[PDB]
Design a protein around this ligand. Structure first.
Ligand code: GDP
Lengths: 89, 22, 201, 8, 426
């Protein structure tokens, strides 16, 4: 019923009868900022909080743990190999 | 002071939405 | 004959060596049955030993090595405590030398498929998989169990899980590592692992 | 236990 | 090797200590069923400081949860990580010390000494050589302030050469819970100053003030407040269980800071404490750890250090530090805060290198400070206690069990002697 210039928007309330069916709850937003500067999904993107609790500022873990002696006092020819991959000379 | 749901932009709404969403 | 006489390894040993002693007997002053020093074996078949990225590694790689079977379990909390200490000792002996020096075959006592996968993604050394009956015959050959499920043949309980143990060429017991044993000296017994007379020739 | 023979 | 004996006293010490073994099990990777998970070398390499192998492969904490009201430790059972402690490590209670220092210390706690000193000397003698004691106990209630300090007197008098440590939460001037605040406050302190090695203070409304501004949370529970304190507990003994370039022992911390035997009271901070809305705004650098840690509002005790002057203090960094960017900048904060540090000690400030960070961080820092800024917090303890004591109020329940007028005045005079000793050293 749109060929005759429909003037009553009551037809769009038959399906969302309880208003708590989560289909019309926050489904549209038509302010000028979201109609001029907006890309495909970079508005409704969840933010990374933590995975180790409130003390976790971000993700480091114990798999990234090596002490200063074990990290750099390593066997020499392995360091000769891995610096060769990144400009030893 | 009235306290509303995290949808409303009254008092804080950025970090208030994240740990207990509502 | 070592370390036990009643094992699936040594009963297949005393079988296989005996008919080929018969093959030399009817072909020919041979003596029957053949001696223990005269018997020889292949311990691990062609498709047994699997490395980290799940490709075939030949048995021939194991010359000039100190190879050791590490009885273990993912859910066992003794094993979860001894696991990074064995990770330390395996690491520091490989690149502590110009040639790779020690080697551990991972032989497991896990519940199911997914249990071994969680206990294998963190292992650098070789392993044997559970559905192959080499795992079952090896644990009776070394007399290793959690508790008494299967009846031992008049034997006791030599080790408790875990116990890493260095092996010989013909399956002989080389020298014992008492993680939990009569010595029961935990978390340090990998220091006793010498690599001079324990060579897999 | 019965021990292996040392190398002669 | 080194062993630390943990004791939880009072309602607060049980909840704070519950979140201590929450975070320590997170550092070393212990599944709450007892087994280990994490497959790292250095997590359990030094594990005997807080754990004992129990011939099942599990790691029982060396802690003794201990009170007189059974409900608050029964909720430790119902809560997470209540399965690690031994059942023998619990000292039961039936009557419940109802916020009375006299009931906790003298009369009803006396028959529970024979069970808690029996279990602490059993776990002490089970090792080769003990290192130190650590407790968490409250100064606001009765089962923490009165009966917790019971344990302090015997353990010091039967292990004199060893050291001990307290995490003491204090009554608050702004918010008023447990109307018998200053009796438990003064009665705990004068006994504490003669049988404690070093005591370091925690204030409740400083913990709420952190969670309001720097953490920026609307309404969480006490579990967040215990998370900050467990961050400080993890820090202050991180090097006792992890390596470092410039190490730190708990009694290294004692020798390097305490001048004089009468003053051993410290102020505790921890950094970083920033909201997740500013984690993208925060590019984690060594100087912004230091300026955060030298912020009066970051402190876990709500005593303002701008009024007082720091005598000596120690900063303990964790993680991977460019240590010259640590220590010449640790000079650089001494130089701008020339009026915030005392004049007769060159190098008032100490640096420490713990080589392992906490969970979810590349680097953190734990602050401990011997300051003259505690004398204002002890000043309104004096003003509260004198108002309670001007014409013989609130204290006949104490004297009904054997208190004397002679000894309350000694509690007041000893602690006024202590706030006097802070006052001259300015
Ligand atoms: N930091 C902290 N403080 C607490 C906790 N529970 C209670 N408190 C404080 O302790 C006071 C209650 O007295 P309390 O010491 O628990 O009485 P008790 O049962 O005799 O130990 C209140 O003022 C609270 O602010 C907690 O879990 N953590």
């Amino acid at each position: 019923r749109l060929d005759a210039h429909n003037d009553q928007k009551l037809t769009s309330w038959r399906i969302p009868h309880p208003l708590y069916t989560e289909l019309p709850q926050g489904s549209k937003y038509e302010t000028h900022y979201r109609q001029s500067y907006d890309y495909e999904d970079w508005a409704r993107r969840p933010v990374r909080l933590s995975k180790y609790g409130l003390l976790g500022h971000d993700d480091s873990g114990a798999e990234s743990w090596t002490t200063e002696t074990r990290s750099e006092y390593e066997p020499p020819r392995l360091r000769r190999d891995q610096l060769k991959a990144a400009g030893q000379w | 002071m009235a306290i509303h749901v995290s949808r409303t932009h009254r008092e804080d709404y950025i970090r208030s939405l994240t740990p207990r969403p509502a | 004959s070592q370390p036990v006489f009643a094992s699936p390894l040594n009963v297949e040993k005393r079988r296989l060596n005996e008919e080929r002693a018969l093959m030399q007997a009817q072909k020919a002053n041979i003596q029957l049955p053949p001696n223990y020093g005269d018997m020889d074996l292949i311990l691990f078949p062609e498709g047994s030993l699997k490395n980290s990225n799940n490709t075939v590694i030949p048995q021939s790689h194991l010359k000039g090595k100190s190879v050791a079977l590490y009885f273990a379990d993912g859910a066992d909390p003794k094993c979860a405590s001894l696991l990074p200490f064995l990770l330390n000792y395996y690491r520091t002996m490989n690149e502590g030398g110009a040639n790779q020096k020690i080697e551990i075959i991972f032989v497991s006592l896990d519940r199911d498929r997914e249990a071994f996968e969680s206990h294998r993604a963190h292992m650098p050394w070789l392993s044997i998989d559970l559905e192959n009956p080499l795992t079952e015959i090896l644990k009776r050959h070394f007399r290793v169990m959690k508790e008494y499920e299967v009846p031992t043949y008049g034997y006791g309980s030599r080790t408790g899980v875990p116990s890493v143990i260095v092996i010989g060429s013909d399956g002989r017991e080389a020298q014992f590592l008492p993680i939990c044993s009569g010595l029961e000296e935990g978390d340090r017994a990998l220091l006793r692992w010498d690599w001079r007379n324990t060579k897999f020739a | 236990v019965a021990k292996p023979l040392p190398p002669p | 090797m080194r062993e630390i004996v943990h004791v939880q006293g009072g309602q607060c010490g049980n909840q704070i200590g519950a979140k201590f073994w929450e975070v320590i099990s997170d550092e070393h990777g212990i599944d709450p069923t007892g087994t280990y998970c994490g497959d790292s070398d250095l997590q359990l390499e030094r594990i005997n400081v807080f754990y004992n192998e129990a011939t099942g492969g599990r790691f029982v904490p060396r802690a003794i949860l201990m009170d007189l009201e059974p409900g608050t430790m029964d909720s430790v059972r119902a809560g997470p990580f209540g399965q690690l402690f031994r059942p023998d490590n619990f000292v039961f209670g039936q009557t419940g010390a109802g916020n009375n220092w006299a009931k906790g210390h003298y009369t009803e706690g006396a028959e529970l000494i024979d069970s808690v000193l029996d279990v602490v000397r059993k776990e002490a003698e089970g090792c080769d050589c003990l290192q130190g004691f650590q407790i968490t106990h409250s100064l606001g209630g009765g089962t923490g302030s009165g009966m917790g300090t019971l344990l302090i007197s015997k353990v010091r008098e039967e292990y004199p050469d060893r050291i001990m440590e307290t995490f003491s939460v204090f009554p608050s001037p702004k918010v008023s819970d447990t109307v018998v605040e200053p009796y438990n406050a003064t009665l705990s302190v004068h006994q504490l100053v003669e049988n404690a090695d070093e005591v370091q203070v925690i204030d409740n409304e400083a913990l709420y003030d952190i969670c309001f501004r720097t953490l920026k949370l609307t309404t969480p529970t006490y579990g967040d407040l215990n998370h900050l304190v467990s961050a400080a507990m993890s820090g202050v003994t991180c090097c006792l269980r992890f390596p470092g370039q410039l190490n730190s022992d708990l009694r290294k911390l004692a020798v390097n800071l305490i001048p004089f035997p009468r003053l051993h009271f410290f102020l505790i901070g921890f950094a970083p404490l920033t909201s997740r809305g500013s984690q993208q705004y925060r590019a984690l650098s060594v100087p912004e750890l230091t300026q955060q840690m030298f912020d009066a509002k970051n402190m876990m005790c709500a005593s303002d250090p701008r009024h007082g002057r720091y005598l000596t203090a120690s900063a303990m960094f964790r993680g991977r530090m460019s240590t010259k960017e640590v220590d010449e900048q640790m000079l650089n904060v001494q130089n701008k805060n020339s009026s915030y540090f005392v004049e007769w000690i060159p190098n008032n400030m100490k640096s420490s290198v713990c080589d392992i960070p906490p969970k979810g961080l590349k680097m953190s820092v734990t602050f401990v400070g011997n300051s003259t800024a505690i004398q204002e917090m002890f000043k309104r303890v004096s003003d509260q206690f004198t108002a309670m004591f001007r014409r013989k109020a609130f204290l006949h329940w104490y004297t009904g069990e054997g208190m004397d007028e002679m000894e309350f005045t000694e509690a007041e005079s000893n602690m006024n002697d202590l706030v006097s000793e802070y006052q001259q050293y300015q």
